[PDB]
C-alpha cells in the first residue's frame, strides 16, 4: 500500500535471524551498541552549521546533502577486520530501499560526492565518531535511526529509540540541492527570518501588516509533516520541492482535502476567528494539528502567511508577494470578460470574472528540472482557493520567468497566474451576437511588491512578472500567453559563440506565402546558472522587419562581449527569447532556446619540484580558438603564494595556433596554493585557466 505517512512506522527486528539458526548460537562475538550520541544540542556544531539551531525541537535536525557528526559507543572496539555494520534511516510504515524510504548508510573510507555514507573520523576506546553525509536529493521528513551489525546468522539491530529520530530538511546552503540559494543575505531573509511584513491596501495608500511566521516554534515542524500526511502525500516525493510546494498550495486551504484554513469573505465569520484578527501562523497551525480539522477563517494574506511558514519551516526559501488590482479569470481565456447590458451598465448576471483590490500569494525558490533551462528560480504558488487545477483548489508552481515572457504552456497553472498580473479588460455587449466595446490594457496588476531584505520596506517586483505597460514587449508577451492559452516560419541560431568575444544571434524568417508581411518582434538575452535558474537579462531589443513574399530573411543581432562578460559565472548558459508578431495577421511566433558558450582553454603545467624556497617552472599554454588572428595578446600569471604576478605579451597569435610561456617562480608559502592564468587580446578577452599546486 502507499507509503504516505511520516507518522506511521514499521517495527524493525532487533534480532533478524536468517534460515534455521542452531540452538546455542552465541551472539557474544559480535558488536552491540551501548550508546548513540548525536551531538544534537542547539549550541553544538551540527545544528549551528546546519542552520537548524533555532528550532524549538530537542531532536537532531539537519539539512540534506551536508555532513554531520555522530558517535557510536560499542561493547568492544570496532575492528574492521572482523566487524561490519551500517547505519540505517527509515521513514514511514512501508519503507523500501528503491523508494528512498529505507536508507542504508555504509561505513566508508572516504565520503563520495552526493552519496549517503559515513566516515570514521575518530576512535577512542570503544567509541567511533562518524561523519555522516546525506544525499542532496534525500526525502524531507522525520527519520528513525538504527545501527545494524551484520553476522553470519543475520542482522543485529538497535531497538526503537525515539531520542535518535532525526529530521532531514531542504538545504538552501548546499550547492547540489534543488533549493540552493547562493546569497547568504537572501537565505537569511527567505529561510531563517521568522517574522515578516505583508503589503495590502490600495496602490496609492499602501498598508503594511506584520506577520509572525513562527517556523521555529515548538510543534510547527511536526505540524508541517502532519500536513503532508494529511494530504496522503507519498513519502518518495517529499524530497522534491516542486511536489512539496504543489501539495502545500492545496493543503493550506480547506477545500477538497480537509486542509488548514477555511476561506471566508462574508463580513460575519460565524463560529470562528475573523481573517483580520490573526497576526501570524502559529496559532492556526497548532490548532489544525490539535483539532485535526480545518481552522475558520482566512483570506489571501492569511493563506499566504501560513503557506510561507510551511515553506520556510521545511527549508524551501519563500516570500510573500502582493499584486494590486488582481484579476480573477473564471473561464480560462486569460482576459477579463466584462459583459455590458444595452443600457451600458454592467450585466452582473453574465459577468463572472472579477478584480480584487489586492491579492497575496507565495513564491518558492527552486530549480525546475521538469522545464527547459532558464525557468528555475522564483515559482509562484498560491493556496488561496480561486480556480480548480486538475480537480483541486491549488495553484503552482508556475515559473515567474515563464510568466514574464508569456510561455504559459509550462506547468503548473501559469495561464491563471499570468491573467492575475496582466490580463486585459474586454468590455463586451451581449445582444439578442457579441460586440466588443472597449479594451483596457493597463488596469490589472498595477504593482507587485514583497518585503525588502534587511528592513520592513517594500520592494517593487512588478518587472519580474511582466514587461512595463506601454512597452511593445508587454503586448508581444501577452499575445504569446494568449497563444499558448500566415505561412511564416521563424527560427534562430546563435552562431559560433565563444566566451570572451562578440557574437551574432541570427534570427531567420521564411515566408512561404505570396503576401508581404510586416513583423514586430522582441529579443531577450539572459544569463542562467547551469542548474537552469535565471540570473539576469543582459540584452533586450525590439525590432521591425518587412518580409517579402516567397523569401528567406536573416536578421543579425550583434551581442557584444561587454554586454554579457560582466555577469557571467561558472558553467552559466545563455537563454534567448524571440517573439515575433506578423502584424497583418496578428499571428505570433515565439521561441526560446539556451546555449552554452564555447570556452577557450588555457593550460597550466609545472615542471620542477614544488618546494618553497627553490625554483619551479610554470608553463602556460594557450591555443587560439578562433579562425581569426588575435592581436596584442596579454597573458597574465598570478599565484598568491607561488609567484609574484607576471605578464607576457604576444603581438600576434595566428588562427588555431598555440603559444607557450615559461615562467620561473619561487614559492614563499607552502601547502595548498594555486596558479591562475588570464588572457586578453584586442578581440578575445578575459579567458582564464587555473591549477591547484601543492608546495
Amino acid at each position: 500500500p502507499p507509503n504516505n505517512s511520516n507518522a506511521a512506522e514499521d517495527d524493525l527486528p532487533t534480532v533478524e535471524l536468517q534460515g534455521v539458526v542452531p540452538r546455542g548460537v552465541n551472539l557474544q562475538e559480535f558488536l552491540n551498541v551501548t550508546s548513540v550520541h548525536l551531538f544534537k544540542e542547539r549550541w553544538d556544531t551540527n545544528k549551528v552549521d546546519h542552520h537548524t539551531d533555532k528550532y524549538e525541537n530537542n531532536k537532531l535536525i539537519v539539512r540534506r546533502g551536508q555532513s554531520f557528526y555522530v558517535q557510536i559507543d560499542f561493547s568492544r572496539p570496532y575492528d574492521p577486520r572482523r566487524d561490519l555494520f551500517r547505519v540505517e534511516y527509515v521513514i514511514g510504515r512501508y519503507p523500501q530501499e528503491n523508494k528512498g524510504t529505507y536508507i542504508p548508510v555504509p561505513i566508508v573510507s572516504e565520503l563520495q560526492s552526493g552519496k549517503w555514507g559515513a566516515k570514521i573520523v575518530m576512535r577512542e576506546d570503544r567509541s567511533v565518531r562518524l561523519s555522516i553525509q546525506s544525499s542532496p536529493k534525500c526525502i524531507v521528513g522525520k527519520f528513525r535511526m538504527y545501527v545494524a551489525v551484520w553476522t553470519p546468522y543475520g542482522v543485529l539491530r538497535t531497538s526503537r529509540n525515539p531520542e535518535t529520530d532525526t529530521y532531514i530538511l531542504f538545504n538552501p546552503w548546499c550547492e547540489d540541492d534543488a533549493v540552493y540559494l547562493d546569497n547568504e543575505k537572501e537565505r537569511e531573509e527567505y529561510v531563517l527570518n521568522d517574522i515578516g511584513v505583508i503589503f495590502y491596501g490600495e496602490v496609492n495608500d499602501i498598508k503594511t501588516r506584520s506577520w509572525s511566521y513562527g517556523q521555529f516554534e515548538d510543534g510547527i515542524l511536526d505540524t508541517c509533516l502532519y500536513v503532508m500526511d494529511r494530504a496522503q502525500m507519498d513519502l518518495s516525493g517529499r524530497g522534491n520541492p516542486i511536489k512539496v510546494s504543489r501539495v502545500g498550495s492545496a493543503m493550506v486551504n480547506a477545500k477538497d482535502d480537509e486542509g488548514v484554513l477555511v476561506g471566508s469573505w462574508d463580513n460575519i465569520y460565524a463560529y470562528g476567528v475573523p481573517p483580520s484578527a490573526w497576526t501570524g501562523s502559529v496559532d492556526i497551525l497548532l490548532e489544525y494539528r490539535s483539532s485535526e480539522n480545518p481552522v475558520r477563517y482566512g483570506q489571501c494574506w492569511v493563506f499566504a502567511g501560513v503557506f510561507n511558514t510551511f515553506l520556510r519551516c521545511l527549508g524551501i526559501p519563500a516570500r510573500i508577494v502582493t499584486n494590486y488590482f488582481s484579476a480573477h479569470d473564471n473561464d480560462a481565456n486569460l482576459q477579463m470578460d466584462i459583459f455590458l447590458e444595452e443600457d451600458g451598465n454592467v450585466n452582473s448576471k453574465l459577468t463572472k470574472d472579477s478584480v480584487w483590490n489586492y491579492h497575496c500569494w507565495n513564491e518558492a525558490w527552486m530549480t525546475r528540472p521538469d522545464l527547459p533551462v532558464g525557468f528555475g528560480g522564483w515559482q509562484a504558488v498560491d493556496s488561496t482557493p480561486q480556480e480548480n487545477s486538475d480537480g483541486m483548489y491549488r495553484c503552482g508552481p508556475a515559473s515567474v520567468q515563464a510568466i514574464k515572457h508569456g510561455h504559459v504552456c509550462f506547468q503548473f497553472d501559469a495561464p491563471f497566474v499570468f491573467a492575475e498580473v496582466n490580463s486585459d479588460l474586454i468590455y463586451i455587449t451581449a445582444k439578442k451576437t457579441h460586440v466588443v466595446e472597449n479594451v483596457d490594457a493597463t488596469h490589472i496588476g498595477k504593482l507587485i511588491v514583497t518585503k525588502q531584505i534587511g528592513g520592513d520596506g517594500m520592494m517593487d517586483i512588478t518587472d519580474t512578472y511582466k514587461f512595463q505597460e506601454g512597452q511593445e514587449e508587454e503586448r508581444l508577451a501577452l499575445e504569446t500567453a494568449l497563444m499558448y492559452g500566415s505561412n511564416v516560419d521563424m527560427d534562430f541560431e546563435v552562431e559560433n559563440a565563444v566566451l570572451g568575444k562578440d557574437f551574432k544571434l541570427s534570427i531567420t524568417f521564411r515566408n512561404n506565402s505570396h503576401n508581404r508581411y510586416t513583423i514586430t518582434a522582441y529579443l531577450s538575452a539572459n544569463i542562467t546558472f547551469y542548474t537552469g535558474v535565471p540570473k539576469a537579462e543582459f540584452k533586450k531589443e525590439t525590432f521591425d522587419v518587412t518580409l517579402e513574399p516567397l523569401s528567406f530573411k536573416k536578421e543579425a543581432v550583434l551581442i557584444q562581449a561587454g554586454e554579457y562578460m560582466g555577469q557571467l559565472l561558472e558553467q552559466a548558459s545563455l537563454h534567448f527569447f524571440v517573439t515575433a508578431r506578423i502584424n497583418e495577421t496578428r499571428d505570433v511566433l515565439a521561441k526560446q532556446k539556451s546555449t552554452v558558450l564555447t570556452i577557450p582553454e588555457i593550460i597550466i603545467k609545472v615542471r620542477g619540484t614544488q618546494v618553497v624556497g627553490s625554483d619551479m617552472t610554470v608553463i602556460v599554454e594557450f591555443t587560439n580558438p578562433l579562425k581569426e588572428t588575435l592581436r596584442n595578446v596579454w597573458v597574465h600569471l598570478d599565484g598568491p603564494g607561488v609567484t609574484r604576478p607576471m605578464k607576457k605579451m604576444f603581438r600576434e597569435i595566428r588562427p588555431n595556433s598555440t603559444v607557450q610561456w615559461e615562467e620561473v617562480c619561487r614559492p614563499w608559502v607552502s601547502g595548498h596554493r594555486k596558479l591562475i592564468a588570464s588572457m586578453s587580446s584586442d578581440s578575445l578577452r578575459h579567458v582564464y585557466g587555473e591549477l591547484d599546486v601543492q608546495i
Partner: peptide
C-alpha cells in the same frame, strides 16, 4: 480585507 472592486 480583500474585496472585489467594480470595473473601472
Amino acid at each position: 480585507x480583500x474585496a472585489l472592486l467594480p470595473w473601472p
